[PDB]
Amino acid sequence: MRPPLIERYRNLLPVSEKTPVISLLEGSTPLIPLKGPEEARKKGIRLYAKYEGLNPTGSFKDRGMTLAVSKAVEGGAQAVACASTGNTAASAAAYAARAGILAIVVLPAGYVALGKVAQSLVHGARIVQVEGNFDDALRLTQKLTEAFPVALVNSVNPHRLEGQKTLAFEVVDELGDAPHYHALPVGNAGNITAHWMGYKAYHALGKAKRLPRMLGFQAAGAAPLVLGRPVERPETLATAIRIGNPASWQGAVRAKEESGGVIEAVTDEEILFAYRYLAREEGIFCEPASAAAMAGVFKLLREGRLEPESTVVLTLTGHGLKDPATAERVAELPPPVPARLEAVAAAAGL
Amino acid sequence: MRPPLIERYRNLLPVSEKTPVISLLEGSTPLIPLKGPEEARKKGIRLYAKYEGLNPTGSFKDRGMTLAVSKAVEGGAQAVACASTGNTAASAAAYAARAGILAIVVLPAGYVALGKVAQSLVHGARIVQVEGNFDDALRLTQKLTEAFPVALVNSVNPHRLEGQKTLAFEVVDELGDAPHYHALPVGNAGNITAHWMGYKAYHALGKAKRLPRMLGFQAAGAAPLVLGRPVERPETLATAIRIGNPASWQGAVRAKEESGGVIEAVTDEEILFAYRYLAREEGIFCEPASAAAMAGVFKLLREGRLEPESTVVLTLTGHGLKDPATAERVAELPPPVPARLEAVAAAAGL
Ligand SMILES: *Cc1c(COP(=O)(O)O)cnc(C)c1O
Ligand SMILES: *Cc1c(COP(=O)(O)O)cnc(C)c1O
Numbered sequence: 293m294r295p296p297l298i299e300r301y302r303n304l305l306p307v308s309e310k311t312p313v314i315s316l317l318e319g320s321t322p323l324i325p326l327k328g329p330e331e332a333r334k335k336g337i338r339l340y341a342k343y344e345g346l347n348p349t350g351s352f353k354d355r356g357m358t359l360a361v362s363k364a365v366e367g368g369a370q371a372v373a374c375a376s377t378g379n380t381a382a383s384a385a386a387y388a389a390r391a392g393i394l395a396i397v398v399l400p401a402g403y404v405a406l407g408k409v410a411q412s413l414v415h416g417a418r419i420v421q422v423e424g425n426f427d428d429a430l431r432l433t434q435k436l437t438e439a440f441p442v443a444l445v446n447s448v449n450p451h452r453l454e455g456q457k458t459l460a461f462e463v464v465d466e467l468g469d470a471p472h473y474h475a476l477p478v479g480n481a482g483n484i485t486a487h488w489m490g491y492k493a494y495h496a497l498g499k500a501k502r503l504p505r506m507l508g509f510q511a512a513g514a515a516p517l518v519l520g521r522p523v524e525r526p527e528t529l530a531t532a533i534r535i536g537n538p539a540s541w542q543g544a545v546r547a548k549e550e551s552g553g554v555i556e557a558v559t560d561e562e563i564l565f566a567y568r569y570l571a572r573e574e575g576i577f578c579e580p581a582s583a584a585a586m587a588g589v590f591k592l593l594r595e596g597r598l599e600p601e602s603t604v605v606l607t608l609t610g611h612g613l614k615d616p617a618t619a620e621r622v623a624e625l626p627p628p629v630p631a632r633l634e635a636v637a638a639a640a641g642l
Numbered sequence: 643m644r645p646p647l648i649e650r651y652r653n654l655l656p657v658s659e660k661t662p663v664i665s666l667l668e669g670s671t672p673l674i675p676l677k678g679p680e681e682a683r684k685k686g687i688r689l690y691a692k693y694e695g696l697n698p699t700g701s702f703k704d705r706g707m708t709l710a711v712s713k714a715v716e717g718g719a720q721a722v723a724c725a726s727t728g729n730t731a732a733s734a735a736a737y738a739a740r741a742g743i744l745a746i747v748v749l750p751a752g753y754v755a756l757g758k759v760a761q762s763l764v765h766g767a768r769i770v771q772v773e774g775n776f777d778d779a780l781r782l783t784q785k786l787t788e789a790f791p792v793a794l795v796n797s798v799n800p801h802r803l804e805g806q807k808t809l810a811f812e813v814v815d816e817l818g819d820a821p822h823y824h825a826l827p828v829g830n831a832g833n834i835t836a837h838w839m840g841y842k843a844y845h846a847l848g849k850a851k852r853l854p855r856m857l858g859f860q861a862a863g864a865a866p867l868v869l870g871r872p873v874e875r876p877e878t879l880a881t882a883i884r885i886g887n888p889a890s891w892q893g894a895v896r897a898k899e900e901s902g903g904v905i906e907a908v909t910d911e912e913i914l915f916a917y918r919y920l921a922r923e924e925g926i927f928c929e930p931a932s933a934a935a936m937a938g939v940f941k942l943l944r945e946g947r948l949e950p951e952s953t954v955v956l957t958l959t960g961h962g963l964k965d966p967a968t969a970e971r972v973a974e975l976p977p978p979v980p981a982r983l984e985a986v987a988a989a990a991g992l
Contacts, residue, residue, distance in 0.1 A: 293816045294672040316925055317674050317693070322667035323644070327742075343667075346696050349927065350963055371992070390677075390925030396990045401978035410969040414962065416922040420989040424981030435983045440992045466643055572766035575666050575740030577699065577732075612764065613700050613963035620756060623763035628751035631774035633785050639770045640746045642721070642790045 294320055297358050301458050304493065305359060306451070314362045314391040316348035319355055319458055323466045323605070326574050331593045335600040339589065340471070341570075342459060345578050345611025349386045349411070351379040351532075352483065352609050355459060356452030361387040363451045364443035371396055371418075372445040375426075375433040377408035378531065379610060384445050385417035394418055396442060398433045400425055407617070408531075447480040447539040456483055460490025463605055470500045473598060475585040476607035478508040478517060478544060478555060479533035483609070485543030488551055504605070506553035508544065509588035515557040517544055529560050529618060532581030532610060558587035566590060568622060570608070577612030585609070644670075648709055651808050654843060655709060656801070664712045664741040668697045668704035669808055673816050673955070676924050681943045685950035689939065690821070691920070692813060695928050695961025699761070701882075702833065702959050703733035705809060706802030711737040713801050714793030721746055721768075722795045725776065725783040727758040728881065729960060734795050735765035744768050746792060748783040750775050757967070758881075797830040797889040806833055810840030813955050820850045822952035825857040825935040827959050828867060828905060829883035831894030834858045837957070838897035854955070856903035858894065859938035861931075865907035867894055879910050879968060882931030882960060908937040914972065916940060920958075927962030935959075 296315035298307055307313075326339040344352035361384070364372050371394030374384050381397050388395035395417040397409070401424070409419055422429060437444045445452065464470055470491050478484050484506055494500040510518055511528030516536055526536040538544060548555050558566075566586035570576040585606045592598050612619060629635040646665035648657055657663075676682075676689040694702035711734070714722050721744030724734055731747045738745030747762060751771040759769060772779050787794040795802065814820050820841055828834050834856055844850040860868055861878030866886055873886035888894060898905050908916075916936035920926040935956045942948050962969060979985040 293670060293812065317672035322698075324667050325643075327740075343698070346698070348672075348693075348696070348925070350961070371990070373990075386921075386925045386927065388925075389922055392677075394991060396986075396992075398986055404975065406970045406973045406975065407966060409975070410966065410973045411927065411962065413973045413975075414918065414921045414927060414969050415925065418990045419975060420986050421975070421978035422981040422986060423978055428981045432981060432983055432986050436986055436990070436992070439983065440987055442990075442992065568764070568766075571736075571764045572739050573742075575698070575736040575738075575765065577736065577761065577764060611700070611961075611963060612761070613961065616757065616760065616966050619760040619764050623756060623760040625754075625756060625759075625771060626769055628771045628773050631772040631778040631782060633782050633789060636748060636770050636772060636782050636786055637790055640721075640723075640768050640786070641744065642746075642786070642792065 297355060297455065297458055298362060301461055304461065306454055310366060311362055312365045314365060314387055315358050316354065316386065316390055318347045318358050320462065321346045323463065324576065328573065329569065337598055337600060338603050340605045341576055342463060342605060342607045343576065344607055344609050345582065349379065349383045350611045350614045351383060352456065352459060352607065353379050353383040356455035357383040357387045357445065359455030360445045360449050360451040361391050365391050365393060367443065368441060369443040370394065370441045372443045373398065373433055373436055374445050375399065375430040377404065381409060381412040381417060385412035385415035389415045396420065398422065398429050400429050447482040453482055453486045453489060456486035457490030457493060459607060460487050461494055464494050464500050467603065470502050470504045471605040472504060472602035473507050473604045474504040475507040475509065475588045475604065477533050477581045477584045477609055478510050479535040479538065481538040481540035481544035484508045484547050485540045488547035503551060506547050506551040507588055508548065508555040509558050509584045510555065511563060511584060512557045512559040517555045518557045530563055530580040530584055532579060533584060556588065558584055558591055562587040562590065576608060578608040579610040579612055579615040580618050582609040647705065647808060648712060651811055654811065655804055660716060661712055662715050664715060664737055665708050666698040666704065666736060666740055668708050670812065671696050673813065674926060678923065679919065681940065685948065687948055687950060687952050687954060689954045689956060691926055691956045691958050692809060693926065694957060694959050695932065699733045699736045700961040700964050701729040701733065702806065702809060703729045706805035707733040707737045707795065709805035710795045710799050710801040711741050715741050715743065717793065718791065719793040720744065720791045722793045723748065723783055723786055724796050725749065725780045727754050731759055731767060732761035732765065735762035735767035739765045746770060746786065748772060748779045750779045797832050803832055803836045806836030807840030807843060809957065810837050811844055814844050814850045820852055820854045821955040822854060822949060823857050823954040824854045825859065825938050825954060826957035827883050827931045827934045828858040828860045828894065829885045829888065831867065831888040831890035834897055835890045835893030838901055853901060856897050856901040857938055857942065858898065858905040859934045860907050861913060861934060862907040862909045867891065867905045868907040880913055880931035880934055882929060883934060906938065906941065908934055908941055912937040912940065921962065926958065928958040929960040929962055929965040930968055932958040932960050
């Protein structure tokens with residue numbers, strides 16, 4: 293039923309019989325067809341949500357991690373390393389535990405909320421805090437990949453991009469062709485770069501007639517790609533895309549230019565609106581960063597920038613359960629009422 | 643495109659052409675073959691984990707809710723209601739949202755933490771806390787469904803049980819035959835009941851060669867089915883199975899006797915151990931209650947009560963992201979080290 297990602301696309305991936313398949317049955321996620329919004333429905337525009345939140349660790353990063361770790365193990369690596377918290381750390385820790393190797397996470401001795409590393413820790417991640425800054429931490433991470441058999445699994449790891457482009461493969465397999473547009477969040481730009489690589493690869497194989505316009509969106513307070521310059525003070529509630537200087541900058545610009553798409557911004561308020569829309573009207577619960585993709589579609593529709601009768605696919609990068617802080621900001625218990633049927637039906641709106 | 647759960651097994655479910663399919667592409671969850679544990683390899687036993695945590699809302703509840711809501715709407719219902727929290731409320735809210743109807747959750751004021759219903763609220767759940775106790779909320783919840791166009795989607799909703807039968811169908815479709823043993827958590831016992839009914843249903847069709855032995859497990863502090871009598875004040879860190887009087891008592895007992903299986907208890911300590919094992923060894927992150935199933939396998943293994951060379955399927959009911967409280971609880975961050983390559987490599991264990 294649910295096969296290993298690398299197995300499903302073995303012929304299209306940099307693997308061989310010598311590649312130890314370290315999988316958690318990631319990928320092959322649901323492509324939920326959305327009912328609306330009505331602004332899209334009235335123009336005959338159909339939306340589909342690639343629910344990447346339904347991956348083993350909760351984010352699409354499992355796609356690149358499964359391959360990155362598999363190749364790392366093939367290369368004889370005793371452990372994978374990254375200089376980040378959140379999903380990347382959680383995914384790396386999970387696959388390292390599956391592979392039976394160590395997962396190293398180097399971070400500055402500063403303040404770190406256990407929420408950002410709790411998941412990676414339960415998996416057995418080796419978190420090391422150093423008396424330095426983000427620069428020193430990422431520096432020590434590299435040197436650790438030069439003096440010891442450690443594989444750096446950060447955003448620039450080629451294998452991560454190779455594995456993440458499979459999402460595009462799955463979309464085409466389901467729809468029968470590439471969509472007209474494809475919206476997704478943009479943090480370090482590795483995912484958008486991979487997406488484009490995927491669609492171009494499927495077109496070169498003859499499995500896709502068209503190439504979609506990549507619609508990447510960033511949070512207003514953290515849109516270095518929109519401003520065309522690094523943002524030394526990234527600000528946004530969408531933690532996953534709180535990036536001031538994307539590692540895959542060049543890749544993002546290329547995908548934007550070649551696909552004839554755009555990389556624009558949406559405010560946190562817009563992100564929160566899309567966040568609620570997906571949950572309350574589509575039944576889809578994703579984290580804010582992911583909602584940004586839907587916020588992007590709302591923006592273009594509002595501007596009438598999406599051709600009618602077109603198909604729009606959105607990559608909801610992470611599951612809502614990933615960020616309880618935002619859920620609690622939106623959630624609220626109503627004032628209690630008397631234990632009477634009349635009062636209940638009233639407060640219920642019946 | 644991919645056919646929804648209730649359509650995949652339409653011939654085995656009480657649905658028809660007039661049944662409005664309210665789906666979020668739930669089901670078809672991964673069946674991850676576990677590496678161990680060692681105690682299992684020792685006897686040549688094979689364990690497979692049915693990752694129900696990868697369902698739309700994060701729990702297997704979606705299997706029953708997709709059918710419950712679909713039927714409710716077919717019946718003309720304008721909303722569904724329950725007196726639950728956690729996973730049931732979140733699931734009911736998600737599908738209600740998908741269906742475009744209301745999801746009412748009646749709770750006793752002051753008894754429920756915001757976190758326990760945050761997910762449902764994000765989906766637009768209409769929470770109504772009454773000035774009384776669970777008995778009052780439970781009482782007027784059914785009264786609400788009697789006086790108004792609201793379908794009751796509580797534990798005993800026959801459709802929720804029928805929909806949960808599909809999990810067994812999927813296990814057989816992939817393995818080719820039913821496993822020798824099938825362990826899972828036991829709260830209201832509606833799931834273990836559904837599992838059994840699903841297995842003997844596929845067996846009556848010829849799709850399943852044999853019938854598995856249902857191995858149900860409860861937390862020691864909340865094991866009414868193990869003690870053979872209700873538990874006034876059930877207690878355990880596994881909130882999902884913290885039930886003192888299972889609504890499906892009878893169904894669970896029958897499934898136990900008919901399958902020649904068991905319904906035993908495991909301590910919270912044992913649950914946490916399995917919890918850590920799955921994540922630290924298999925790379926699978928599930929919530930405490932789900933880990934109870936694995937803790938049970940460990941138990942029967944120590945007691946040498948599992949036939950060697952046998953296949954064991956574990957239903958991991960919910961995803962670990964469902965309980966950030968526990969994950970951060972067992973979490974631990976070691977003291978910082980100097981920003982020297984020799985310091986990091988050492989702390990990491992290189
Ligand atoms: C990593 C991540 C992103 C950002 O993707 P980039 O490839 O870094 O652009 C967005 N959302 C979630 C949930 C993520 O885990
Ligand atoms: C609902 C639930 C259970 C209990 O299942 P029952 O059918 O009540 O026995 C166990 N674990 C999780 C994660 C659940 O959501």
